[PDB]
């Protein structure tokens, strides 16, 4: 009987879904089952799945994302700095989608991912918040590295998104592209150029994962995290997390040492884990 992906009618998952799954897996599950409850604007517009230019078909929305990538790649390779870079790729049988906030080259020529976290109150981030945030930026590197190394193909995206390449691209898509100097023929031709540009433009793997916490008003830095990426640990975690989404195990609540997370959880009054873990 249905897996959570089928039950919640999810064709793919967002990077933040797995980040909040690190906070509480049951809370993330309830967030998909009961969505009626529950700034980087491109990532926020991706979570509600809005898009940059008029949003009719899903082939149009993905075509816009592909045109953005084709422009951001040479911008990064010449200006050394870009923002809001879309990432996607199949991870353990599930397509993962996200938006990297900032990519730039350090003075030593290292490709650095920057993740800025603003806070209302000038308080240090919790250990549980840093665990989750470190997992999020590690996922960005996991997907990005696979993208620029040729491990993410147009076929894999079509399989999960059910994009139709027979449907021609809308005028708002073709207008956005021609105004950028590029003439898209078909969605299939666009996807093939994205693959080429991702893999043949000398894009290195991400060298630095940097998280910065800032108090908004005073601009005071509340901490800086240089994430120690270990790909074997990262893969083990997504394997475990995707095992729930694909339906191979039951969702888990928080550990008893972190029962304080339930104090401000929307679904505390219906969670059976909160009663008997
Ligand atoms: S009440 Fe606690 S265990 Fe249950 S979903 Fe919320 S955070 Fe998770």
Curated annotation (Swiss-Prot):
Keyword terms: 4Fe-4S, Cytoplasm, DNA damage, DNA repair, DNA-binding, Exonuclease, Hydrolase, Iron, Iron-sulfur, Magnesium, Metal-binding, Nuclease, Nucleus
Binding site for Mg(2+): 101, 115
Cofactor dependency: [4Fe-4S] cluster; Mg(2+)
Effect noted on mutating residue 265 to A: Abolishes iron-sulfur-binding and affects exonuclease activity
Binding site for [4Fe-4S] cluster: 24, 262, 265, 271
Cofactor note: Binds 1 [4Fe-4S] cluster.
Gene Ontology biological process terms, A to Z: interstrand cross-link repair
Location relative to the cell: Nucleus; Cytoplasm, Cytosol
EC number: 3.1.-.-
GO molecular function, one term: single-stranded DNA 3'-5' DNA exonuclease activity
Highest taxon in the source lineage: Eukaryota
Entry GO terms, CC: cytosol; nucleoplasm; nucleus
UniProt similarity note: Belongs to the EXO5 family.
Function: Single-stranded DNA (ssDNA) bidirectional exonuclease involved in DNA repair. Probably involved in DNA repair following ultraviolet (UV) irradiation and interstrand cross-links (ICLs) damage. Has both 5'-3' and 3'-5' exonuclease activities with a strong preference for 5'-ends. Acts as a sliding exonuclease that loads at ssDNA ends and then slides along the ssDNA prior to cutting; however the sliding and the 3'-5' exonuclease activities are abolished upon binding to the replication protein A (RPA) complex that enforces 5'-directionality activity.
The protein's assembly and partners: Monomer; monomeric form has weak exonuclease activity. Homodimer; homodimeric form is unsure but has much higher exonuclease activity, suggesting that it could homodimerize upon DNA-binding. Interacts with the replication protein A (RPA) complex.
Name of the protein in question: Exonuclease V
Organism the protein comes from: Homo sapiens (Human)
Taxonomic lineage from the root: Eukaryota, Metazoa, Chordata, Craniata, Vertebrata
Region of the whole protein represented: 69 to 358 of 373
């Amino acid at each position: 009987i249905l897996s959570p992906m089928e039950r919640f009618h999810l064709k793919y998952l967002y990077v933040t879904d797995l980040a909040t799954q690190n906070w509480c897996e049951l809370q993330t599950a309830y967030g998909k089952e009961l969505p009626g409850f529950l700034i980087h604007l491109a990532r926020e517009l991706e979570l509600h799945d809005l898009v940059t230019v008029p949003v009719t078909t899903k082939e149009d929305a993905w075509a816009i994302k592909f045109l953005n990538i084709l422009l951001l790649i040479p911008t990064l390779q010449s200006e050394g700095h870009i923002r809001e870079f879309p990432v996607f790729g199949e991870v353990e049988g599930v397509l993962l989608v996200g938006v990297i906030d900032e990519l730039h080259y350090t003075a030593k020529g290292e490709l650095e991912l920057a993740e800025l976290k603003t806070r209302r109150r000038p308080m240090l981030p919790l250990e549980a918040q840093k665990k989750k945030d470190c997992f999020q930026v590690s996922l960005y590197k996991y997907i990005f590295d696979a993208m620029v190394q040729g491990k993410v193909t147009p076929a894999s995206l079509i399989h999960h998104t059910k994009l139709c390449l027979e449907k021609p691209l809308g005028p708002s898509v073709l207008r956005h592209a021609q105004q950028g100097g590029f003439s898209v023929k078909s969605l299939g031709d666009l996807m093939e150029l994205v693959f080429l540009s991702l893999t043949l433009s000398d894009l290195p793997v991400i060298d630095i994962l940097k998280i910065e916490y800032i108090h908004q008003e005073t601009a005071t830095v509340l901490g800086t995290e240089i994430v120690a990426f270990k790909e074997k640990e990262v893969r083990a975690k997504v394997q475990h997390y995707m095992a729930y989404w694909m339906g191979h195990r039951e969702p888990q609540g928080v550990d008893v040492e972190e029962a304080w997370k339930c104090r401000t959880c929307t679904y505390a009054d219906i969670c059976e884990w909160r009663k008997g873990s």
